[PDB]
From Swiss-Prot:
Compartments where found: Secreted
Organism (species): Oryza sativa subsp. indica (Rice)
Stated family: Belongs to the glycosyl hydrolase 1 family.
Superkingdom of source: Eukaryota
Disulfide bonds: 176-211, 190-198
Enzyme Commission number, as recorded: 3.2.1.21
GO molecular function: beta-D-fucosidase activity; beta-galactosidase activity; beta-gentiobiose beta-glucosidase activity; beta-L-arabinosidase activity; glucan exo-1,3-beta-glucosidase activity
Active site: 171, 385
Catalyzed reaction equations: Hydrolysis of terminal, non-reducing beta-D-glucosyl residues with release of beta-D-glucose
Keyword Ion transport applies: no
Enzymatic class: hydrolase
GO cellular component: extracellular region
Name of the protein described by the UniProt record: Beta-glucosidase 12
């Protein structure tokens, strides 16, 4: 069949979570508001079930139970994120350090290590400080860089004696496209005609400005870590990027070039700068002056600025050539001149999960990993997220909700697909399942469940292992 035994010796298995989706205690322990507190409370129409992360999965109180669950599966590692506003309630150093917040993350870190689970920490998982949003529009201003740098530094000082694995940003693609092009995610900015129908924004500039600043904050932080912390702490620092796999809509060459543009715009947007020191040619060509430019100093800094790359994979799309549109309607969403669908002639590329955008296509996992090997020099890679969701359904009896054979099937195929890619050259060192628990799934609220364990939101946030948890327990033996 397949088990951890099939994978290289020393290969790491774990689960992933994020602060805002899991923690709750949104206003406890001195936590300041994030742009997602604001977004969920001020724009409930923009959340499927009009909900928020106030309580979420209550990991702020329940983290000991969480650790116990992952130890029982036999996980090696846990990827979680630190809430910026839990450490610095208004984003900046001069705003004050929150000692109760530090205490929380020490508690979790120590709990994890006491059970032999390695902590991998994400610094930014979208919960950007409201105070910095109000002050200078957050990631739209270059001031974000030094504030982020100071926040990372406090984390290295407080936790770096025990934490040896650091991720700066999680899926900057999703943050920038949904936060600034579609406006469907916090901070909910977009051009007035775009899907989010936002009161402020510019879908043709802001996504590029925000992500340019994320890259610079990342590289700056990497340099800081390598200069002051890596010698005496000996940890690794990286970044998490998401990519779909893009299948050409037909065998034509223009559709093959469309697929290439799709991956350049989603993935290369961040990979090209890190490997080659510049944005992809196609982006520079098609976007011109709306895409900011690295100085030579900055180009030098970003190139090679990582020890590993975290890769998130979920699904694949068909990529179809799009004619230009254009001139007044410029948006990041259409800038690639590619049309992405999950359906071709009424036939979905794979079976569709609870999330409309998620099609089950294990073949694409292999394809993406080999593409990274061949086009980017085969960098050290962790799979930082991979998973699937079922609907939250109030009518199902508990015992039925725990029967998640679709999830088992998803992981089985995807772990086989990952194995075959490793058996070819893929430089993959670990894998993290999204996610340990059902959680706040952003604009979908609690309408969907990604967890390997069930969370009863109506019964005190109780955790119940799903069938897939028992499956992982077997998969992870010895
Ligand atoms: Zn509680």
């Amino acid at each position: 069949p397949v088990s951890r035994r099939s994978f290289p010796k020393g290969f790491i298995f774990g689960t992933a979570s994020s602060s805002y989706q899991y923690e709750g205690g949104a206003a406890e322990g001195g936590r300041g508001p994030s742009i997602w507190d604001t977004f969920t409370h001020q724009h409930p129409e923009k959340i499927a079930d009009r909900s928020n992360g106030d309580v979420a999965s209550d990991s702020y109180h329940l983290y000991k139970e969480d650790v116990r669950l992952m130890k029982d599966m036999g996980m090696d590692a846990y990827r979680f994120s630190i809430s910026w506003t839990r450490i610095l309630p208004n984003g900046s150093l001069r705003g004050g350090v929150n000692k109760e917040g530090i205490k929380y993350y020490n508690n979790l870190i120590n709990e994890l290590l006491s059970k032999g689970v390695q902590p991998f920490i994400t610094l930014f998982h979208w919960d950007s400080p409201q105070a910095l949003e109000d002050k200078y529009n957050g990631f739209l201003s270059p001031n974000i860089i030094n504030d982020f740098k100071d926040y990372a530094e406090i984390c290295f000082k407080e936790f770096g004696d025990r934490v040896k694995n650091w991720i700066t940003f999680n899926e900057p693609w999703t943050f920038c496209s949904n936060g600034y092009a579609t406006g469907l995610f916090a901070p909910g900015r977009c051009s007035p005609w775009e899907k989010g129908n936002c009161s402020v924004g510019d879908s043709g500039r802001e996504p590029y400005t925000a992500c340019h600043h994320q890259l610079l904050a990342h590289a700056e932080t990497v340099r800081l870590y390598k200069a002051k912390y890596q010698a005496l702490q000996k940890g690794k620092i990286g970044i998490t990027l998401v990519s779909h796999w893009f299948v050409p809509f037909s065998r034509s060459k223009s559709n093959n070039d469309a697929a290439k543009r799709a991956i350049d715009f989603m993935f290369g947007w961040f990979m090209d700068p890190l490997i080659r020191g510049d944005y992809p040619l196609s982006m520079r060509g098609l976007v011109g002056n709306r895409l900011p430019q690295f100085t030579k100093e900055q180009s030098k800094l970003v190139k090679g600025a990582f020890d590993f790359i975290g890769l998130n994979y979920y699904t694949a799309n068909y990529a179809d050539n799009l004619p230009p549109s254009n001139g007044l309607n410029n948006s990041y969403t259409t800038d690639s001149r590619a049309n992405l669908t999950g359906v071709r002639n009424g036939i979905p590329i794979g079976p569709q999960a609870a999330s409309p955008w998620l099609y089950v296509y294990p073949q694409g996992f292999r394809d993406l990993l080999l593409y990274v090997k061949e086009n980017y020099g085969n960098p050290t890679v962790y799979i930082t997220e991979n998973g699937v969701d079922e609907f939250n359904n109030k009518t199902l009896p508990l015992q039925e909700a725990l029967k998640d054979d679709a999830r088992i099937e998803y992981y089985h195929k995807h772990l086989l697909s990952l194995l075959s890619a490793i058996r070819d050259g893929a430089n993959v060192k670990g894998y993290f399942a999204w996610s340990l628990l059902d959680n706040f799934e952003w604009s979908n609220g609690y309408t969907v469940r990604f967890g390997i364990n069930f969370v009863d939101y109506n019964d005190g946030r109780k955790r119940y292992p799903k069938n897939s948890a028992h499956w992982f327990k077997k998969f992870l033996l010895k």
